[PDB]
């Protein structure tokens, strides 16, 4: 039973037909980055809600973040559904690092996954993602799709737990405005 | 002679101290071209790199002490005749990302100082390079990539004969490094924002110049098909509605020779231009003495009936916007003995008795 508002921030569409090979995409949960594996033609977008505006500019962070992962979602007969979603939390993209959390989803049509993780570092509890200092790193959400013809897209929604604190400013480049493809909104329709 | 070497006091892990001279450690120079413009970056490097090639009493202390509890003090020394002036800003940022914006809106945010060389002989501030702790080190600022920027906010009112140079004096002081941390309590006594409301320009003339700055400060600053944002501002945009006492820092960015009386008041977008009854609103008359360059404005709780939105839809017009605006109005007339426009910097320092309401789902654009 959801209460407080989650905000959408990262979406990624699997490659268009006839791409049917198993694929994957990595979400940088703090920097707001979407990196598809290899050269697969993923269609990715990042939105600009307050949460992302904070995550992308706050140098130091500390606290709990709640994440909702939504999986869409295509006109597929339930009986013929065979798409699976594997997701992993990681502290790096190095093979030597192990998964911090694993979830497996195999619901037909669409799916919803709620989970949370903590950001905590050495600076009196604060962490500065990917800084050389103390080898601090960000958090990655790796999503694997076994059937990109049934699975159309991933949606990451985020929420700051009241214990979330920030400090310091990062000089970011201008943030491009949002601005379709698949009819999942009245506006798109 | 031999002795108990392990009992020697060679483990002096205490901070940098002594006379102010003893606590100096580096000096840098900023070339101020006689022909520069607003938004013109003057200096842009890493804070750590300041120590390269330096030979001062605490240079080696600074670079070897593993923990410092004091603050970094920086003093700018420079001047120009009263017949001119300009606006320089020095700011410390925690880090950067590729092709970062150099617009003052994002630079100022964290920690900074602003002064006009045509009135101040020098200017200084202290800061904590570790925004969420009470201690720091040279190695920490080196690997955390702390950045420093000097930028020309406003160009010269009257160009100096030759290029001039501002000099920065870097030293350590015994002021305790208190942290500056933002959090989600709905009620906060002091929420610092350092938000660059904007650069106002009032050309010389006898016209009725009116400027509007929205108090719906969330969403960042506009640009082309993009926007600028910094942490303090995006943090307050987390709430849907808010209220509190507003504390603004107003800076005379043009020379003393350019003068104008400016009225400040809180009203709404329904208030039109050329309405010669602006003083019917409760307001403040701000005049600048030739020495004076900075004025604090205070808008207490009594200036607002209710809270107001942190964001508005960018398509919203003034005639359909019930959020309050800060008006800056030329009470008399902008003039002087020399050519040049009157630039007036407006920065929201922070909010006292901050009350945040609800939760903002967010709007992609700003204004």
Strands B71-77 and B122-127: antiparallel
| A vs B: CB pairs below 8 A | 153
Q: For residues B71 and B92, what is the distance between their CA atoms, to the nearest angstrom? A: 13
Q: Are the CB atoms for B287 and B330 separated by under 8 Å? A: no
Dist. CA B33–CA B13, nearest whole Å: 43
Are the C-beta atoms of residues B34 and B163 closer than 8 Å to each other?
Answer: yes
Distance of residue A147 Cα from the nearest chain B Cα, in angstroms? 32
Residue A93 CB partners (closer than 8 Å, separation 6+): A26, A140
Q: At a CB cut-off of 8 Å and minimum separation 6, what does B157 contact?
A: B84, B85, B86, B118, B254, B255, B257, B258, B338, B340
Q: Domain limits of chain B?
A: 1-367
C-alpha B236/C-alpha B113 separation (Å) is: 22
Q: B1-367 is classed in which CATH architecture?
A: Sandwich (2.60)
Residue B60 to residue B205: CA distance in whole angstroms: 56
Maximum distance among all Cα pairs of chain B, rounded to whole angstroms:
89
Judge whether B244 and B351 are in contact, CB under 8 Å.
yes
Nearest-by-CA chain A residue for B104: A171
Query: Hey, which bits of chain A come out as E strands?
Result: 7-13, 23-28, 33-36, 43-46, 58-72, 85-90, 101-105, 111-119, 140-145, 153-160, 165-171, 175-176
Q: What is the CA radius of gyration of chain B?
A: 23
- Residues in chain B with CB shorter than 8 Å from the CB of A7 are 361-362
The owner of tokens 């920490």 is: B140
B362:A49 CB<8 A: yes
Rounded-to-integer distance, Cα B196 and Cα B217, Å: 10
Q: CA-to-CA distance for B334 and B340, rounded, in angstroms?
A: 10
Enter the tokens of residue B179. 């942290």
CB B228 within 8 A of CB B244: no
Residue spans of alpha helices (H) in B63-200:
104-107, 138-143
Residue with tokens 């190095």, as numbered in its chain? A94
Contact B73, B125 (CB under 8 A): yes
Chain B, 122 to 181: residues with Cβ < 8 Å from chain A are 130-134, 140, 143-145, 147, 179-181
Q: Judge if the upstream peptide bond of residue A18 is cis by omega within 30 degrees of 0.
A: yes
Residue A80, φ and ψ in degrees, nearest 5: -105, 5
Q: How was this structure determined?
A: cryo-EM
Cα–Cα distance for residue pair B278/B267, rounded to 1 Å: 9
Structure-block tokens of residue B87 = 């606006």
Q: How big is the CA angle at B248 (ends B216 and B146), to the nearest 5 degrees?
A: 90
**Closest to B153 in 3D by CA, of B88, B92, B203:** B88
CA B133 to chain centre: 22
Q: How many CA atoms lie within 13 A of B229 on its CB side?
A: 30
Tokens describing residue B61:
């202390």
- Number of Cβ within a 10 Å radius of residue A17: 7
Chain B closest-CA separation from residue A151 CA (Å): 27
Distance CA B24, CA B167 (A): 14
CA gap B38, B272 in Å, rounded: 29
CB B219, CB B237: distance < 8 Å: yes
Of B132, B147, B218, the CB nearest to A124: B132
Adjacent-strand bridge partners of B259: B335
Closest CA to B96 of B131, B53, B55, B147: B147
A42 vs A12: CA distance, rounded Å: 7
3-class SS of residue B280: helix
The beta strand positions in B6-80, using DSSP E, are 24-32, 40-46, 71-77
Set of chain A residues whose Cβ sits within 8 Å of the Cβ of B145: 131-132
What sign does the CA torsion over B168, B171, B175, B179 have?
positive
What's phi and psi for B336, nearest 5 deg? 170, 180
**In this structure, what DSSP letter does residue B303 have?**
G
DSSP per-residue letters across A32-54: TEEEESTT---EEEE---HHHHH
Q: Is A125 left (phi over 0), alpha (psi -120 to 50) or beta?
A: left
- Domains of chain A, start order: 1-189 (2.60.120.20)
User: Cβ–Cβ of B365/A177 closer than 8 Å?
Assistant: yes
Alpha-helical runs (H) found in B76-157 = 104-107, 138-143
* Rounded Cα gap, residues B77 and B29, in angstroms: 10
- Dihedral through CA B255, CA B258, CA B261, CA B263, nearest 10? -60
Is residue B252 within 8 A of residue B308, CB to CB? The reply is no
């Amino acid at each position: 039973e959801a209460s407080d508002v989650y905000s959408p921030c990262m979406i990624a569409s699997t490659p268009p037909a006839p791409f049917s090979d198993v694929t994957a995409v990595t979400f940088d949960l703090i920097n707001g980055k979407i990196t598809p594996v290899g050269d697969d033609n993923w269609n990715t977008h990042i939105y600009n809600p307050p949460i992302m505006n904070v995550l992308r500019t706050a140098a130091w962070k500390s606290g709990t973040i709640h994440v909702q992962l939504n999986v869409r979602g295509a006109g597929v007969k339930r009986a013929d559904w065979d798409g699976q979603v594997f997701v992993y939390l990681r502290q790096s993209m190095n093979p030597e690092s192990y998964d911090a959390r694993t979830f497996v989803i195999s619901q037909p049509g669409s799916a919803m996954l709620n989970f949370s993780f903590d950001i905590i570092g050495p600076n009196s509890g604060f962490e500065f993602a990917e800084s050389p200092w103390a080898n601090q790193t960000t958090w990655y959400l790796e999503c694997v799709a076994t059937n990109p013809r049934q699975i159309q897209q991933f949606e990451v929604n985020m929420r700051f737990d009241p214990n979330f604190r920030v400090a310091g400013n990062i000089l970011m480049p201008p943030f491009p405005l949002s601005t379709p493809l698949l009819k999942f909104r009245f506006r798109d329709i | 002679m031999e002795q108990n070497l392990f009992a020697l006091s060679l483990d002096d892990t205490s901070s940098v101290r002594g006379s102010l001279l003893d606590t100096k450690f580096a000096q840098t120079r900023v070339l101020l071209s006689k022909a520069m413009a607003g938004g013109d970056v003057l200096l842009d490097e890493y804070l750590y790199d300041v120590v390269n090639g330096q030979d001062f009493r605490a240079t080696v202390a600074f670079l070897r002490t593993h923990v410092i509890t004091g603050k970094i003090k920086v003093t700018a020394t420079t001047n120009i005749s009263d017949n001119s002036g300009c606006c320089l800003m020095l700011a410390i940022n925690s880090g950067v990302r590729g092709k970062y914006s150099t617009d003052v809106y994002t630079i100022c945010s964290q920690d900074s100082m602003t002064w006009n060389p045509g009135c101040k002989k020098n200017f200084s501030f202290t800061f904590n390079p570790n925004p969420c702790g009470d201690s720091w080190s040279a190695e920490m600022i080196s690997r955390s990539r702390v950045r420093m920027t000097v930028i020309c906010v406003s160009g010269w009112t009257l160009s100096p004969t030759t290029d001039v140079i501002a000099k920065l004096d870097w030293s350590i002081v015994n002021e305790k490094c208190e942290p500056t941390i933002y959090h989600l309590a709905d009620c906060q006594n002091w929420l610092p924002l350092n938000r660059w409301m904007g650069k106002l320009t009032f050309p010389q003339g006898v016209t009725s110049e009116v400027r509007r700055m929205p108090l719906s400060i969330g969403g960042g600053a506009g640009a082309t098909q993009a926007f600028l944002a910094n942490m303090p501002n995006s943090w307050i945009s987390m709430w849907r509605y808010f209220r509190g006492e507003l504390h603004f820092e107003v800076t005379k960015m043009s020379s003393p020779y350019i003068k104008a009386t400016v009225t400040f008041l809180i009203a709404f977008g329904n208030l039109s231009d050329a309405f010669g009854f602006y003083e019917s609103f409760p307001h403040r008359i701000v005049q600048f003495a030739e020495v004076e360059e900075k004025c604090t404005l205070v808008f207490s709780q009594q200036e607002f009936v209710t809270a107001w939105s942190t964001q508005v839809n960018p398509r919203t017009t003034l005639e359909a916007d019930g959020c309050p605006y800060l008006y800056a109005i030329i009470h008399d007339s902008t003039t002087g003995t020399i050519s040049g426009d009157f630039n007036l910097g407006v920065k929201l320092v922070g909010i006292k008795d901050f009350c945040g309401i609800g939760s903002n789902p967010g709007i992609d654009g700003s204004r």
